[PDB]
Amino acid sequence: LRLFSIGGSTVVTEWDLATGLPLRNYDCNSGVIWSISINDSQDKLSVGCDNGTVVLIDISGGPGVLEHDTILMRQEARVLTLAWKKDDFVIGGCSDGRIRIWSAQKNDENMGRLLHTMKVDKAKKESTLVWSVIYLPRTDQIASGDSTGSIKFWDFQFATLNQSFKAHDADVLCLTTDTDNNYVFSAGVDRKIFQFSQNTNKSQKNNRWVNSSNRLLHGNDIRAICAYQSKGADFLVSGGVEKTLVINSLTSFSNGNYRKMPTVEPYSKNVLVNKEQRLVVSWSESTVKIWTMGNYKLVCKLTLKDDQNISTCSLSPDGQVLVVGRPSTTKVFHLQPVGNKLKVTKLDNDLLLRTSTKLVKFIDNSKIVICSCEDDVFIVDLESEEDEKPQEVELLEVTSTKSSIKVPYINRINHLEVDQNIAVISRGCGVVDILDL
Amino acid sequence: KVVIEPHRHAGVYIARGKEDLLVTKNMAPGESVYGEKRISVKVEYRVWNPFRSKLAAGIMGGLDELFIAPGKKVLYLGAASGTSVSHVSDVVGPEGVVYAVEFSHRPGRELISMAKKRPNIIPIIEDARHPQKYRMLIGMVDCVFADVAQPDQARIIALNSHMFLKDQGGVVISIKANCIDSTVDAETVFAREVQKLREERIKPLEQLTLEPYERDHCIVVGRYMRS
Amino acid sequence: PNPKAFPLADAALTQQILDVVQQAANLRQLKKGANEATKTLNRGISEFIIMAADCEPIEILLHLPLLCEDKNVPYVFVPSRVALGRACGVSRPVIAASITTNDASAIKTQIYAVKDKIETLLI
Amino acid sequence: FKVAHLQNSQTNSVHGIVLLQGNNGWINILHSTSGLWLMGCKIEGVITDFCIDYQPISRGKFRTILIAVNAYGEVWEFDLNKNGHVIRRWKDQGGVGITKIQVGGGTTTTCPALQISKI
Amino acid sequence: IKTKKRKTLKNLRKDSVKRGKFRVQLLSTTQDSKTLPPKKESSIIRSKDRWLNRKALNKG
Amino acid sequence: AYVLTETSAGYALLKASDKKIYKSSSLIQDLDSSDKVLKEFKIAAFSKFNSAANALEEANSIIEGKVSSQLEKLLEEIKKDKKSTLIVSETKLANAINKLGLNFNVVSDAVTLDIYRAIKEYLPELLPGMSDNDLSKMSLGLAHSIGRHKLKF
């Protein structure tokens, strides 16, 4: 599996899912990227940029290979959203209030040519931005939401408007559709999800969509909606500014139950507690705040220079050594109680500065165990006579399989626990191993 | 009478007198490849036009180290009409070799016609996205100059420099921001292209915007680091 | 259309180009014909050049992109010479039209907007 | 606006329709007696004109086609019986600055039919 | 005080120093671009947030 | 293994001493010295173009990427060893060589770029009987022929 992201710059980042690190940062040749999409055969990534350009990127070489293929015919307005018809056409909604169809068919004279343009009903007071377009295969149509709240269904072949709805009271940020194109769902700033349907045979014959229902389930705006259907799965997953994830059913959207996931599920923890010194240590992005409890006081607050978020932190049983581990570097601090506060000093360990830290634990006040992002496990004595090499720990090799090929991170050490000389590692696949250090 | 002053870079001279100009020695005496002026001091010098071409627009702007010396072999990418290529040939003299690559046929005819009389120019009529096609003609080169006005200039220079350029050789690229995003300040586009070159492997040494000669154009000079 | 015809505009840009050409025809800011477009390119008094992609043979038009590349003048292709002639305001088909230069022109804003939209194609 | 005849084909009953030109390429079609909004047809570009064509299907049955033209010359043909979906789209040869479109030689909005067989 | 500390931090974090006509720019470390995606272009994507929080949407 | 280098003067097949040289990643460190490259690679065969027309025909043959008849003869002069690795600079040329009858194997990779850099750097030293000036003159004539053929001219 390959994962690509755009983050408000000119660069598409392809991720290394084994380590969770940027495998490649490919700078698209023109402008700040607003939209990303992939074609049906998954060979090409189309990115729609701030200066009006749409750029095709051949990713068919393999994981880590991205190449510039074609820049389609340019325009003046920002391409806010993108979609594909087969491998043949690219549809893009723009900020001038209109939807454009480009031909991406090679071996044709129309290649890269802007075939069609269709203007949505503008807002009288202000601008109109087409925030989302999706393509419906079964009924050859384009579904669009704009800033006025209107959902429009367009005949693709003639590039005309079949049907229009004034459903939302605000922006329509996101759209989705089911597998058979029987249902189309829309959401935006209005905080309601709207279901439009063609489920009945008369509606399928007449190609007429019906504003079937709406549901108010989010406290703030909705930025993303997506849907999945299989034999064991039928659900619609949505999220936005409320920072919480809501799960609905697709076929039973109006009737069936929904679940709001907790905003924070601490699978990876950002708070530790030191029993001996009665301390609570919490680390946000570049900040480590420590409280004493006896009644609660903020004894120290550490602000770190590096831009990477702190992945983990570990505090010594006596409370002196604090190891702050990022996927970039790892830094060690000595904390000395000076009055109410603690004076913090930084100890320079070259191995830890060069070492990416996934998981870190302590044997004692001196020795630590680190599982790196490269899955290697080793032991550092910290204070020592000289700067000797850290002790490497032998590990069994997990047998590669179909899931290990497909999802890359499962054959990597996920949990690490230690007590005295015994340690336990567990992989993502479910393998548990005991290390006698 | 006029005086010939040796410029910092080798093979480049400055005429001094009532009127001052930038000049190069003429390989073929008594002939002008285009409508440039000739000064006879004997030895004959052709006059550069920094408004017409971008390389010694960079020289007049004061580039530190040009990577173009009379001993060196240069790969010129984007050689339309051979007008700047004739002066690069004059700089590299008879010993040096300039491989001038051009895609379009209409400047291709006149590039061939000028390389007919100029011996050290090896003309290539072939698209620059594909370095593997003209790999027979090229050996190793000391420097790579780029004048293509394309969005993927960094990719083209990467492909050519990985394949033909020696270690510690030079890359000199002319960047226009209009063939890139062009709706932001040109400095942003120039920073993006420098970062792209760093990603490719070219470690940049300097950058020089070409006012008043060109608008929103820069010359980025860097060194190839194969290691 | 012919492959040599480049850059050919789409329907919306063709609409805007032909509207500006009609306004210039009413303001007498327009030169019609490839010979007169050549003259305006030589004299330097042309804003941009519009050429009809369905000229047969196209090589009557093809000398104008070379001059436009020399003098750095934008040029564009519209599909129909009949449409171009009707926008130019004459009873004959027109394969090349030139928008002349005038700073006191009332249509200056439209001319400079369409000129930028043409330049984005030439990029 | 223009007035035309529409056969509903649920009961094969013919009623009059009022077709109004609006903004953003819109044509709104209303019942002539109820005044209800039957349907709407949108073309792209600045709509300049429209007209009505009739096509006989069978004995006592016919279909109504809306032919709409914008200023560019692109012409849309909608089938008003099939919810106003597009039959076809074409382009006027030459075609710039179009103001009027008009069919003729049969039943027009200018000259209507006195019975369904005369369509 | 606090303003002086902020000025000292800004002078430390500055990566471009001008010397007459010339201006020396720091080449960034190769580790950061490898370990992270590039930093977001602040104004362009702030336009979207301003649009979503515009006043015509009475948002309380 | 074997590597294939196309020059202006003629085709050449160079016998690299190690078959694992193609898979090896120390090529940049090992091939820095001209003497080291000349020691590492030996000339198995050097098949020149007898005629300028034959040189141009082989040139646009490599341009199109198809294997020419003279190149097919040079490849048919293969070693007795089975599944010998051939290194081809162009991927579609490697595809054509694989499509043609070949007991030997073919490999084209980005690792081979350093190797091809070494041979292109020390080609007149490696190729016997060819001066640098002679190679430059051959390249000039071939370039003018290719340009005149690609244009009408």
DSSP string, chain F: -EEEEE-SSEEEEEEES-TTTTT-S-HHHHTSSHHHHHHHEEEEEEEE-SSHHHHHHHHHHHHHTPPPHHHHHHHHS--SSTTPEEE-SSHHHHHHHHHS--SSEEE--TTHHHHHHHHHHSHHHHSTT--HHHHHHHHHHHHHHHHHHHS--
Q: How far is C123 from chain B (nearest CA, A)?
A: 6
> Would you give the distance in Å from CA A58 to the centre of its chain?
22
Q: Is D89 touching A (CB cutoff 8 A)? A: yes
Task: Measure CA C108 to chain center.
Answer: 15
B139–F150: do the CB atoms touch at under 8 Å?
A: no
Range of the domain at C1: 1-123
Chain centre distance of CA A111: 32
Residues D24 and D46: their CA atoms lie apart, in Å, by 7
Q: Establish whether chain B is in contact with chain A, requiring a minimum of 3 CB pairs below 8 angstroms.
A: yes
The SS3 assignment for A399 reads coil
Judge contact between A195 and A182, C-beta under 8 A: no
From residue C56, give the alpha-carbon distance in Å to each of C60, C67, D65: 8, 20, 37
Tokens of A113: 């040519």
* Cα–Cα separations (whole angstroms), residue A245 to A202, A222, A257, A263: 35, 10, 14, 7
> What is the per-residue DSSP string for A76-145?
SS-EEEEEEETTTEEEEEETTSEEEEEE--SSSTTTT-EEEEEE----SSS---EEEEEEETTTTEEEEE
List of residues 6+ apart from F126 with CB closer than 8 A: F14, F37, F38, F41, F43, F119
D44-65: b or e for each residue (b if 16 or more CB lie within 10 Å)? Answer: bbebbbbbbbbeeeeeeebbbb
Chain C residues lying within 8 Å of B182, measured CB to CB:
123
CB B218 within 8 A of CB B199: no
B20 to chain E, any CB pair closer than 8 A? The answer is: no
Distance CA B109, CA B115 (A): 10
Q: End-to-end distance of chain D based on CA atoms, in angstroms?
A: 21
Mutate which of D96, D98, D99 to test chain C, going by most C C-beta atoms within 10 A?
D96
Which of D24, D26, D28, D75 to substitute to test the interface with A, most A CBs within 10 Å? D24
End-to-end CA distance of chain C: 21
CB A326 within 8 A of CB A333: no
Cα angle A188, A193, A199; round to 5? 130
Evaluate whether B133 touches B126 at the Cβ level (below 8 Å): yes
By the 8 A CB rule, do A379 and A395 touch?
Answer: no
Distance of CA A354 to the CA centre of its chain: 27
Q: Can you give the resolution of this entry in Å?
A: 3.0
Contact flag B124-F147 (C-beta cutoff 8 Å): yes
Q: Do A8 and E57 touch (CB under 8 A)?
A: no
Are F12 and F43 in contact by the 8 Å Cβ rule? The answer is: yes
Cβ burial, residue B118 (10 Å; 0-12/13-18/19+): buried
Judged by a CB distance cut-off of 8 A, whether residue A32 touches chain B is: yes
Chains A and F touch (3+ CB pairs under 8 A): no
Q: Check CB contact of B106 with chain C, cutoff 8 Å.
A: yes
- The answer to whether A250 touches A256, Cβ cutoff 8 Å, is no
What residues of chain D have any CB closer than 8 angstroms to a CB in chain C? 45, 71-74, 93-97
- Rounded CA gap, B213 and B223, in Å? 25
SS3 A237: strand
Strand partners, B144: B75, B171
Contacts of A319 (CB under 8 A, 6+ apart): A274, A276, A277, A279, A335
d(CA A409, CA A90): 33
Complete edge-to-edge strand list for the sheet that includes strand A172-177: A172-177, A183-188, A192-197, A210-216
d(CA D11, CA A164) in angstroms, rounded, equals: 27
* DSSP symbol at B183: S
The Cα–Cα gap between A193 and F136 comes to 72
Q: What contacts A224, CB < 8 A, 6 or more positions away?
A: A174, A238, A239, A240
Residue B101 CA from chain centroid, whole number: 11
Q: Please, are residues C78 and C89 in contact by the beta-carbon 8 Å criterion? A: no
Q: Take residue A334 and report the two structure tokens written for it.
A: 């000595």
The answer to whether the CB of E3 falls within 8 A of the CB of A296 is: no
Task: Give the Cα separation of A165 and A178 in Å (integer).
Answer: 19
Q: Report the alpha-carbon distance of residue A21 to residue F14 in Å, rounded.
A: 41
Q: Are strands A279-284 and A368-371 parallel, antiparallel or unpaired?
A: unpaired
Separation between Cα atoms, residue D50 and residue D67, nearest integer Å: 5
* Cα–Cα dist B113/B121, whole Å: 11
Compute the C-alpha angle B102/B103/B105, nearest 5°. Answer: 100
DSSP symbol at E29:
P
Left (φ > 0), alpha (ψ -120 to 50) or beta: where does D96 sit? beta
Provide the token pair at E7: 């000025």
Helix (H) or strand (E) holding A402: helix A402-406
Closest CA to C12 of A99, A151, A141: A99
Q: Which residues contact E14 (CB under 8 A, 6 or more apart)?
A: none
C-alpha–C-alpha distance, residues B74 and A184, integer Å: 60
Q: Does C123 touch chain B (CB under 8 A)?
A: yes
d(CA D41, CA D85): 8
Establish if A140 touches chain D: CB-CB under 8 angstroms: no
Q: Show Cβ contacts of residue D11 under 8 Å, excluding neighbours closer than 6 positions.
A: none
Interface contact C10-A74, CB threshold 8 A: no
Handedness of CA D108, D111, D112, D114 (dihedral sign): negative
Strand B3-6 relative to strand B13-16, pairing: antiparallel
Tokens of D25: 């390429």
Q: Per this entry, what is the length of chain B?
A: 227
Taking a C-beta distance cutoff of 8 angstroms, is the pair F67, F57 a contact?
Answer: no
Of all residues in chain B, the one with the smallest CA distance to F149 is B125
Calpha distance D71→A261 (Å, rounded): 54
Using alpha carbons only, how large is chain B's radius of gyration in Å? 17
C-alpha distances out from residue B145 to A240, B88, C16, Å: 49, 10, 40
Cross-chain CB nearest to C86 (options D72, D74, D96): D96
Q: Which chains touch F (3 or more CB pairs under 8 A)?
A: B
- Collect all residues with Cβ–Cβ distance below 8 Å to B4 and sequence separation of at least 6: B13, B14, B15, B16, B23, B41, B45
**Do C66 and B178 lie within an 8 Å CB cutoff?**
no
Give me the half-sphere count of Cα atoms (radius 13 Å) on the Cβ side of residue C72: 2
Task: State the nearest Cα–Cα gap between D99 and chain A, in angstroms.
Answer: 21
The single-letter DSSP state of residue A280 is E
Contact across the interface for F120 and B138, Cβ inside 8 Å: yes
Work out the burial of residue D87: count CB atoms within 10 Å of its CB; fewer than 13 is exposed, 13-18 middle, 19 or more buried.
middle
* Number of other residues whose CB lies within 10 A of the CB of residue B52: 15
HSE, CB side, 13 Å, CA atoms: give it for residue A150.
18
Domain total in chain C: 1
CB-nearest to B152 from A49, A51, A68 is A68
Q: Does D91 touch chain A (CB under 8 A)?
A: no
Task: Quote the tokens at residue A263.
Answer: 């905003």
The phi, psi pair for A324, rounded to 5°, reads: -105, 115
C-beta atoms of D24 and A208 within 8 A: no
Overall size of chain D counted in residues: 119
Question: D66 near D80, Cβ under 8 Å?
Answer: yes
* Contacts (Cβ under 8 Å, ≥6 apart) of F13: F2, F3, F4, F5, F43, F44, F45, F46, F74
> Residue D45: which of C15, C80, C87 has the nearest Cβ?
C15
Q: What angle do CA F140, F144, F149 make, to 5 degrees?
A: 150
Closest CA to A153 of C10, D88, D86: D86
Helical spans, DSSP H, in chain B = 55-61, 83-92, 105-117, 153-163, 186-200
CATH number at C6 reads 3.30.1330.30
By the 8 A CB rule, do D54 and D119 touch? yes
**Is B204 near chain E, with CB under 8 Å?**
yes
Q: Return the structure tokens found at E53.
A: 């929080």
Q: Inspect the structure and tell me whether chains E and C have 3 or more CB pairs less than 8 Å apart.
A: no
Chain Cα centroid distance, residue A3:
9
- Compute the C-alpha angle A376/A380/A381, nearest 5°: 160
Beta carbons within 8 Å of A379's beta carbon, 6+ residues apart: A363, A367, A368, A369, A370, A390, A391, A393, A437
Contact B182 A51 (CB under 8 A): yes
Chain C hits for D93, Cβ within 8 Å: 80, 82
Inter-chain Cβ pairs, chain C and chain D, closer than 8 A: 28
User: F123 in contact with B at a CB cutoff of 8 Å?
Assistant: yes
Alpha-carbon distance of A101 to A257, in angstroms, equals 38
Of the candidates A241, A48, A17, the residue with the CA atom closest to the CA atom of residue A130:
A48
Q: Are A152 and A159 in contact (CB under 8 A)?
A: no
Question: Which residues of D are less than 8 Å from A162 in CB distance?
Answer: 85
Instruction: Flag if C123 and B182 touch (Cβ within 8 Å).
Output: yes
Instruction: Verify whether the Cβ–Cβ distance B204 to E27 is below 8 Å.
Output: yes
